[PDB]
RNA sequence: UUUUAUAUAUAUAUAAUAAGGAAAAGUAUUUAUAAGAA
């Protein structure tokens, strides 16, 4: 299916219909041998103008 | 009993001088192990001036001396892993399969084959001395290592509960 | 109170009611006194695990409700039932170590669960002379210190030590136990019995006879091996202790009331002990010669019969319907065996070491006799009754009568003795008697008594008998029906490696690689 | 269900055992109270008892948030033969790096394999794993096909 | 060498097997009542909520 | 029966019908049969 | 002797006394032809026999 | 411990009393494998 992901908003207002995302995930790092998050922040498209900073949403 | 039966190696067999004022005496120093190879092992050491044969003869009545009992798997293993720290060295010891050899250091080697140890594989970290290696060899086979049968008791379990269930 | 005449009648629903009542309207929960009569109640069910959880929690909820050496007694008896004997010395380990005081009850327990333990190598875990020793030294503890003794302990203490001398095969002490009990019962009953002597004498003879020495007596007979040693006779104190006892019974014997022992300290030949333990077994079946059932005349045995051909040719018209001419037999039977012999002491459990007798001493032609003497096939008796309905409703004649009388001397054939059968042919390694059992046993298959038992109770004991004939097929050397045996019903019963061993080695020793892995795949298929 | 109060807790029994304490007290949690559950019934701790942080409670006393903050776990340790029956305890899945391991691995840890460095089972060695908020022996674990955190070796 | 363990110790690569038909057909119920069972939307969701 | 393995009875049955063939066509020679007696003689006999 | 160290097979097989269970370091070589043989006492030598 | 008894002001100090005793025989595959020397 299309990819989801669930993410906090971080920056929104800056741009104009875009909010920045911060999307965490889990991946195994065999040199340290621990499950670890990973981040990254995606820049999504707001239609409306309903998302805040500080919001979790789905993407 | 004892001359038939134990057999002797040499473990360790140097000069160890004792820088006096008038020159440098030399002394010999031996360590040896005498084990049965049925499980009785103990160790020995010796110094003496004049010669090493000396050294080495009361290495041997000490080695008599301490003839302790050895616990063992099957007459042929450890009951299960030994991680022993003695005087800076670092024994890893692994309990293996029938048929599997002696894949450990030489030192290692001599005492399991004295006392009977058919079945090991180890690593030593840290100090590597010949010496140490033997003394913590020894200790850590006999302190560190407790019978399945001794731990049954002490947990007031029975045999068939205690032991490991088979996966594949 | 109420939880004691509830256990002592084993009513798990008055257990409910009465715990479920206290709590529901009194506020009332069980202190430690009640919980432990609780463990004693499960441990009645033969429920262990329940009655552990219950001590688990007796030592949780609080110091007040923590066990105290009744309860740990109550324990060991679990043990000893459970024949848990390294459970047993950590419990001991723990009186010691909650600084709990030690009592009388504790020291037999713990000779009690040793002695039980000792019975097998399996169970023992091949210690078994270490474990009989351990229960001698306990006895020797309790003999150095008061405690606290109680009424029944003098008792338990002689059955403690017979169970140390009936599992290791001391037949000499055995006897002497055994002559010194009854001698001691006997006379402290006829010392202290309101009564004449002559007319009670039924009455003091069946107080005096208990089951349980008699079934240790007959153990100790049936684990005979001449090359054994007794692990009593080593030690100081206990070649002491077997000194005094041997010296008193022959003191007893040399100097009223009479037993049948043989006039010797030790039996040293496989005929004295199947004579002694026909002798013993004889003795009890008369409730000591009161009842003079087992001798018999030409005359007892046809006056008997014309008296049930009376009794049961009237019987059979009155009857509504064969069930109920049926249901008038058995009462009839029942009632007969109960009038003619002990019931205590005849039963299956003391036939079951009684037939184990020669077995153990590799005697057929003993074996045969007893079976037949003492035992009776269900379908056989139930073919009997049919034949006499049709004969007196509408030689063999009075033989079918000969053998409605006889069915006093006899019990039914349950699932175990059966096996126990079973047994005697793989020891014998008598093709024929294999043969017989394995039909009499498909046979008893559809009498009533094996229906009446439970689904699960009934695969276990045909997988139990499903084994056997394969370790009687394995022995015999015919692999090939033995893996056919475990083929055949693979899917109905779980084939362990435990039960499959004896045939996985005899099959490895030919090398007999097809036959090897299928019957492991049919093993470890899982 | 801190395994850093589980590392405390077993850091407790190891210093209990080598001063030899027959009586010591852990905290009245759940997580606490299986593990000593579990160790109590393979025979490491010779009894439980409730208690407040005083010693054991003489009668019984129900759980409340009132006493909540001392309530105590009273656990007995065994010593056969001048040796400590529970001679050693260690955490395997650390706080920083947790192990969750699936049923094939937990089989392949009890057959003797490494996985993630993680030494495998002993044979006088026991194992606890919590599935789904249940603490339970890993031989048990994997007789249920559960899915679980690998936490402690106790040997 | 060691990775051919993966695949059972077999050294090369077949092609990938085709399949003779690319989507699923019509007497496949279950496929057609995962597809048109109703989507959920939420922490783990597929769709736009309703709003959105 | 004869306390054997039953590969070595299946070599045995293989090597007596070569065996009975050789002796059909007495492909056998005087030193083979004299080799075949003396190494016979060489080893301990089985017993059933 | 390079030779020797491919054909060697360092994982052996065994199927109260002491099972010998390293005498079986050189059972491997037992199967060849030649070897075969000189065991069957078809040849005075393992040469003679190749 | 518990239950009651006296006395004193539902409670307190004293005295007595305690229900937990059961017996029975027979019922392998163990797995992966890490050595140091000068």
């Not at chain 2, 030489?106 to 006392?115: D, G």
């Not at chain 4, 040796?83 to 691995?105: A, Q, Y």
């Amino acid at each position: 299916a299309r990819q989801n992901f669930l993410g906090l908003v971080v920056s929104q207002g800056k741009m104009q219909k875009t909010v920045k995302v911060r999307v965490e995930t889990k991946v195994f790092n065999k040199k340290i041998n621990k499950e670890l998050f990973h981040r990254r922040d995606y820049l999504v498209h707001d239609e409306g103008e309903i998302s805040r900073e500080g919001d979790l949403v789905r993407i | 009993y004892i001359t038939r039966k134990l057999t002797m190696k040499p473990l360790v067999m140097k000069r160890v001088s004792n820088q006096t004022g008038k020159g440098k005496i030399a002394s010999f120093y031996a360590l040896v192990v005498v084990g049965d190879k049925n499980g009785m092992v103990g160790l020995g050491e010796g110094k003496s001036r004049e010669e090493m044969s000396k050294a080495i003869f009361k290495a041997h009545w000490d080695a008599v001396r301490n003839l302790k009992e050895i616990p063992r798997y099957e007459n042929r293993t450890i009951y299960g892993d030994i991680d022993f720290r003695y005087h800076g060295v670092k024994l890893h010891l692994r309990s293996a399969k029938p048929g599997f050899g002696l894949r450990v250091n030489h030192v290692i080697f001599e005492i399991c084959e004295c006392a009977g140890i058919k079945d090991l594989s180890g690593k030593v970290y840290k100090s590597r001395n010949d010496m140490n290696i033997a003394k913590g060899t020894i200790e850590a086979f006999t302190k560190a290592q407790k019978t399945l049968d001794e731990v049954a008791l002490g947990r007031g379990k029975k045999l068939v509960d205690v032991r490991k269930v088979y996966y594949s | 109170n109420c939880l004691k005449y509830s256990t002592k009648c084993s009513s798990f629903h008055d257990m409910d009611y009465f715990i479920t009542k206290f709590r529901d309207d009194y506020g009332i929960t069980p202190n430690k006194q009640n919980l432990t009569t609780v463990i004693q109640f499960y441990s009645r069910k033969e429920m262990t695990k329940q009655a552990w959880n219950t001590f688990d929690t007796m030592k949780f909820l609080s110091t007040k409700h923590f066990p105290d050496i009744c309860t740990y007694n109550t324990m060991l008896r679990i043990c000893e039932k459970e024949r848990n004997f390294p459970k047993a010395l950590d419990l001991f380990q723990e009186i010691q170590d909650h600084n709990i005081k030690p009592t009388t009850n504790t020291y037999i327990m713990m000779a009690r669960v040793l002695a039980s333990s000792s019975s097998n190598a399996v169970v023992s875990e091949g210690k078994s002379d270490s474990l009989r020793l351990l229960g001698w030294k306990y006895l020797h503890e309790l003999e150095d210190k008061n405690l606290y003794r109680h009424k029944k302990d003098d008792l338990n203490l002689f059955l403690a030590m017979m169970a140390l001398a009936a599992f290791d095969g001391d037949i000499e002490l055995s006897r002497a136990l055994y002559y010194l009990f009854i001698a001691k019962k006997y006379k402290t009953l006829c010392a202290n019995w309101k009564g004449n002597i002559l007319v009670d004498q039924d009455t003091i003879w069946k107080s005096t006879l208990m089951p349980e020495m008699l079934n240790y007596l007959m153990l100790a007979y049936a684990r005979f091996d001449p090359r054994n040693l007794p692990v009593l006779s080593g030690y100081e104190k206990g070649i002491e202790l077997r000194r005094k006892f041997l010296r008193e019974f022959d003191s007893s014997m040399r100097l009223k009331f009479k037993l049948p022992f043989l006039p010797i300290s030790d039996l040293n030949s496989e005929a004295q002990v199947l004579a002694e333990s026909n002798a013993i077994w004889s003795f009890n079946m008369e409730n000591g010669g009161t009842r003079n059932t087992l001798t018999s005349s030409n005359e007892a045995a046809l006056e008997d019969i014309k008296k049930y051909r009376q009794l049961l040719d009237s019987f059979a018209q009155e009857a509504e319907d064969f069930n109920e001419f049926k249901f008038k037999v058995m009462y009839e039977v029942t009632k007969m065996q109960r009038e003619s012999i002990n019931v205590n002491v005849f039963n299956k459990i003391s036939l079951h070491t009684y037939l184990s007798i020669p077995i153990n001493l590799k005697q057929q032609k003993e074996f045969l006799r007893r079976l037949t003497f003492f035992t009776f096939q269900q379908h056989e008796f139930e073919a009997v009754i049919k034949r006499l309905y049709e004969g007196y409703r509408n030689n063999l004649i009075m033989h079918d009568i000969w053998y409605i009388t006889c069915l006093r001397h006899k019990i039914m054939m349950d699932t175990t003795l059966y096996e126990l059968v079973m047994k005697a042919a793989i020891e014998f390694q008598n093709e024929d008697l294999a043969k017989k059992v394995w039909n009499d046993r498909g046979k008893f298959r559809t009498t009533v008594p094996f229906l009446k038992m439970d689904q699960r109770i009934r695969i276990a004991k045909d997988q139990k008998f499903a084994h056997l004939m394969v370790e009687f097929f394995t022995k015999q050397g015919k692999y090939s029906d033995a893996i056919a045996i475990i083929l055949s019903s693979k899917n109905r019963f779980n084939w362990t490696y435990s039960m499959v061993r004896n045939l996985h080695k005899a099959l490895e020793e030919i090398e007999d690689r097809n036959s090897v892995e299928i019957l492991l795949d049919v093993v470890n298929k899982k | 269900m801190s395994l850093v109060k589980l590392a405390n807790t077993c850091a407790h029994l190891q210093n209990c055992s080598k001063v030899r304490v027959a009586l010591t007290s852990i905290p009245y949690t759940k997580l606490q109270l299986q593990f000593a559950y579990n160790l109590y019934q393979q025979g490491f701790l010779s009894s439980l008892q409730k208690g407040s942080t005083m010693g054991p409670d003489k009668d019984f006393v129900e759980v409340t948030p009132d006493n909540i903050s001392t309530r105590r776990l009273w656990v007995g340790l065994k010593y056969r033969d001048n040796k400590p029956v529970l001679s050693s305890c260690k955490l395997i899945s650390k706080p920083n790096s947790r192990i969750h391991l699936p049923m094939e691995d937990m089989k392949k840890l009890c057959s003797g394999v490494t996985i993630r460095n993680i030494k495998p089972l002993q044979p006088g060695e026991l194992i606890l794993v919590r599935a789904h908020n249940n603490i339970m022996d890993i031989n048990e674990a994997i007789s249920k096909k559960l899915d679980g955190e690998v936490l402690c070796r106790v040997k | 060498g060691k990775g051919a363990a993966k695949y059972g110790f077999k050294s090369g690569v077949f092609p990938t097997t085709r399949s003779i038909l690319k989507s699923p057909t019509t007497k496949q119920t279950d496929i057609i009542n995962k597809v048109k069972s109703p989507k959920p939307k939420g922490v783990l969701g597929i769709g736009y909520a309703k709003g959105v | 029966k004869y306390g054997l393995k039953i590969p070595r009875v299946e070599a045995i049955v293989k090597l007596v019908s070569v065996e009975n063939s050789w002796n059909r066509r007495n492909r056998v020679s005087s030193d083979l049969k004299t080799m075949d007696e003396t190494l016979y003689r060489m080893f301990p006999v089985f017993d059933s | 002797e390079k030779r020797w160290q491919t054909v060697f097979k360092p994982k052996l097989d065994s199927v109260i006394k002491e099972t010998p269970f390293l005498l079986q370091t050189f059972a491997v070589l037992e199967k060849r032809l030649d070897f075969a043989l000189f065991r069957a006492m078809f040849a005075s030598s393992v040469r003679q026999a190749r």
